[PDB]
Amino acid sequence: TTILAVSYNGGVVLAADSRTSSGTYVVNRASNKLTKLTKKIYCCRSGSAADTQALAERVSNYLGSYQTDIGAGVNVATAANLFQKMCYMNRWNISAGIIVAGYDPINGGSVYSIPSGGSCVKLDYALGGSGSIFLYSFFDANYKPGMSKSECVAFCQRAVAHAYSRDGSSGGLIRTITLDADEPEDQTIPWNRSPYCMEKDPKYVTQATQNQPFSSSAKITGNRMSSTG
Amino acid sequence: SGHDQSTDVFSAEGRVFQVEYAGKAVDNSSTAVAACCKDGVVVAVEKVHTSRMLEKGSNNRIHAVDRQAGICICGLLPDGRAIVSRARQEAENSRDIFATPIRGSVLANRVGEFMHAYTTHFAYRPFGCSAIIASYADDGPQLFVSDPSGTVAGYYGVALGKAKTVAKSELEKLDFSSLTCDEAVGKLASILHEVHDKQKDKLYEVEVAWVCDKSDRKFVHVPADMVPAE
């Protein structure tokens, strides 16, 4: 699982892979890990699918009633607090890493990370899942804060592609959603149109020289791909 | 007296007589010649048959040790087979421990060390054969000779056996700088045919092998229709 959220000037972009895997077999290759909480607030879920689904459904139910009670919109901080409380009271029984990202008219675009421990950190960008470990040095080198909306979406897709190119537990479709003062817009790009994979990378085209032909010299001359040669 | 019964005994003049007797046994064997042609090594031996009913290829004296290395035996054939087995063990050790073909000089040194160890202990006798090592390794074409005494020497052209001096004199007429393996095969076969006495060894065959660029640097026997008839 690879999930991330990046804030730009207007709002936020949430990116995720689509792969639910039972260890080494792909149970689902078209999952949707970007779960709607309110109209402008979403969460990226990593870990136990049942636990994260139940947490998101309960938080969405709580937030929907709260809008009717107060008669106004909900800030991203409220949803972040709801997840933080619910994950902290159940931290020993659930396996969940949550990213709460959204737009509210008061604080603009917000991104919150709630790891397995149950804390809540407000960040410019957040990463999560097994494939997030591959992206940290990718963000330290290639990520510049202050990108445009389209630039942020493209960077998020490229980061997700780079993450699941190396992570066996991640892969499949790349799903992104943009949340800002305008209408939220989703996008799903397939693997065959992904911004990066090692199969299309020209520097991994040449195979490692492992199957030496039987030769009278120590000179390495490529792999043996023929019985006669 | 008792000064020549075992190899662990020096003579009064500093000689090991058992090794000399083994060398004498080598000197009574069939003639072999070899040439390093600056692009490969060609070895040619004569096989004397005591029966006319022998299958073709019987009593092979040239054996491949590695892909690029081979050994010709001049002398007691079973001792040469033991030496060939030791050389094959040495060659595969290099390919398994060091992942590289064994250099011709290294293989020759190993063969010489193996043959020398049997000239120092009372419980063993020296090998009664000389070994001609022909290699085409990363150190270029190499031709070495290992003496029953265990001393190894590199040659451009070498002759061993009963008809050794005349074969060596014929080899002295070659250039070895413009000489190529294609013509060297014929030259060695002609020398062996000319130097051999036809009234004492009625059944004789010429067995020629080589390793140069034409065989992809692989030690093999010649094509059958390449050596001269006589």
TrEMBL record, chain A:
The active site is at T1 (nucleophile). Coiled coil: none annotated. GO terms for biological process: proteolysis involved in protein catabolic process. One of its GO terms (molecular function) is threonine-type endopeptidase activity. One of its GO terms (cellular component) is cytoplasm. It catalyses: Cleavage of peptide bonds with very broad specificity. It is found in: Cytoplasm; Nucleus. Keywords: Cytoplasm, Hydrolase, Nucleus, Protease, Proteasome, Threonine protease. Residues 208-229 are annotated as: Disordered. Component of the proteasome complex. Belongs to the peptidase T1B family. Component of the proteasome, a multicatalytic proteinase complex which is characterized by its ability to cleave peptides with Arg, Phe, Tyr, Leu, and Glu adjacent to the leaving group at neutral or slightly basic pH. The proteasome has an ATP-dependent proteolytic activity. This is Proteasome subunit beta. It comes from Leishmania tarentolae (Sauroleishmania tarentolae). The lineage of its organism: Eukaryota, Discoba, Euglenozoa, Kinetoplastea, Metakinetoplastina. The chain holds residues 55 to 283 of 283 of the full protein.
UniProtKB/TrEMBL annotation, chain B:
Keywords: Cytoplasm, Nucleus, Proteasome. GO terms for biological process: ubiquitin-dependent protein catabolic process. Coiled coil: none annotated. It is found in: Cytoplasm; Nucleus. Signal peptide: none annotated. Residues 3-25 form the Proteasome alpha-type subunits domain. One of its GO terms (cellular component) is nucleus. It comes from the Eukaryota. InterPro entries: Ntn_hydrolases_N, Proteasome_alpha, Proteasome_alpha-type, Proteasome_asu_N, Proteasome_sua/b. CDD domains: proteasome_alpha_type_3 (cd03751). Belongs to the peptidase T1A family. The proteasome is a multicatalytic proteinase complex which is characterized by its ability to cleave peptides with Arg, Phe, Tyr, Leu, and Glu adjacent to the leaving group at neutral or slightly basic pH. The proteasome has an ATP-dependent proteolytic activity. This is Proteasome alpha 7 subunit, putative.
